[PDB]
Amino acid sequence: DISDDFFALFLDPTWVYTCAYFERDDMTLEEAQLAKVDLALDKLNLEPGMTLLDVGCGWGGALVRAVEKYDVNVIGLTLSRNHYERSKDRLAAIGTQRRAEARLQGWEEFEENVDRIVSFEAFDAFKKERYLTFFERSYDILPDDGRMLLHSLFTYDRRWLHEQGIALTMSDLRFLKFLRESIFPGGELPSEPDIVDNAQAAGFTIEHVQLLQQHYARTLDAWAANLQAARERAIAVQSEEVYNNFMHYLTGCAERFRRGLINVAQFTMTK
Ligand SMILES: C[S@@+](CC[C@H](N)C(=O)[O-])C[C@H]1O[C@@H](n2cnc3c(N)ncnc32)[C@H](O)[C@@H]1O
Ligand code: NA
After folding, report:
1. What residue segments make up the domains of the chain, in order of their start?
2. Which of 195, 271, 185 lies closest to 220, judged by CA?
3. For tag attachment on the chain, is the N or C end more exposed, with fewer CB atoms within 10 Å?
């Protein structure tokens, strides 16, 4: 796979590799990633000592922020060994009396009770045959007053796009094929109904939906600018092919969020 050393060339120190939130226009990338995490965690009404599950925890930035700012116990799940190892190391290096653990484990195998759940851009990696199952499991492990913040990408169909004045081009179809045949996200995104209808069938109320479309455009622009500025080092760590493929993903996805072809949002879900 792609080395952490490559991603380090374009991500900020949190290692967060999902849509940032430019809560103030002059925030740096790091500040906007912490703002995105805090935006989500504030919606969970966390109290010190609660237990927070992060489904699909990446390299651990949100878990570290949850411990540091919110003083919660944390459990992070991932399917990626590289994600797990960095998460494990970062959490162990936090000075805290709380429980802070990362696991190489899917949510399908996790059955422990937790007080709150967060997830950032993992849901699009789930098979559509598991969308309902995921919400059922999340409902079951939460207490009666539990809350989940689902931050997910989602797509729109031709009819909706057309009603909004947007068309999918032959280039867009080529780009979707590029995504499907690569490690990059976006090849088989859920629709908004795939999120909302399954969450509601499992018993959740959708309290709030916050769209972040243009924040993602800006985030992807920042990653691309960072990667081009480090091009020689990126080629050295990987190769020119990989570098160019990443640039194609980052810039192509930025263009598509700007145009409105796809979206990303935080869904506050309550019981
Ligand atoms: C696009 S990354 C998001 C990483 C992190 N949330 C962030 O904001 O940078 C998706 C992560 O979800 C994880 N993931 C995908 N499917 C999963 C599953 N069924 N259970 C647990 N984690 C999963 C991947 O292994 C990866 O760590
Ligand atoms: Na404390």
Report:
1. 4-270
2. 185
3. N
Q: In sequence order, what DSSP letters do the residues of 27-89 get, joined into one string?
A: --HHHHHHHHHHHHHHTTT--TT-EEEEES-TTSHHHHHIIIII--EEEEEES-HHHHHHHHH
The closest ligand to the CA of 47 turns out to be 2
- Pocket of ligand 1 contains residue 260 by CB under 6 Å: no
Residue 67's contacts (CB-CB under 8 Å, 6 or more residues apart) are 74, 91, 94, 96, 98, 100
Does residue 58 line the site of ligand 1, with CB under 6 A? yes
CATH architecture observed for domain 4-270: 3-Layer(aba) Sandwich (3.40)
- Please list, in sequence order, all residues whose beta carbon lies within 8 angstroms of the beta carbon of residue 87, skipping any fewer than 6 positions away: 57, 58, 59, 60, 63, 76, 78, 102
Name the CA dihedral angle for 106, 112, 115, 117, rounded to a multiple of 10 degrees: 10
Across the chain, the runs of DSSP E, i.e. the strands, are 51-55, 73-78, 100-104, 116-120, 147-155, 205-211, 262-270
> Does 63 count as an annotated binding residue?
no
Residue 180 CA neighbour count, 13 Å, CB half: 9
**How determined?**
X-ray
Is 19 a residue of the active site? no
Task: Give me ligand 2 centre to Cα 71, in Å.
Answer: 6
Instruction: Compute, in angstroms, the gap from residue 88 CA to the centroid of ligand 2.
Output: 20
Q: Alpha-carbon distance 233 to 6, whole Å?
A: 8
Half-sphere exposure of 214 toward its Cβ, with a 13 Å CA cutoff? 3
232 is in an annotated binding site: no
Q: Is the CB of 125 under 6 A from ligand 1?
A: yes
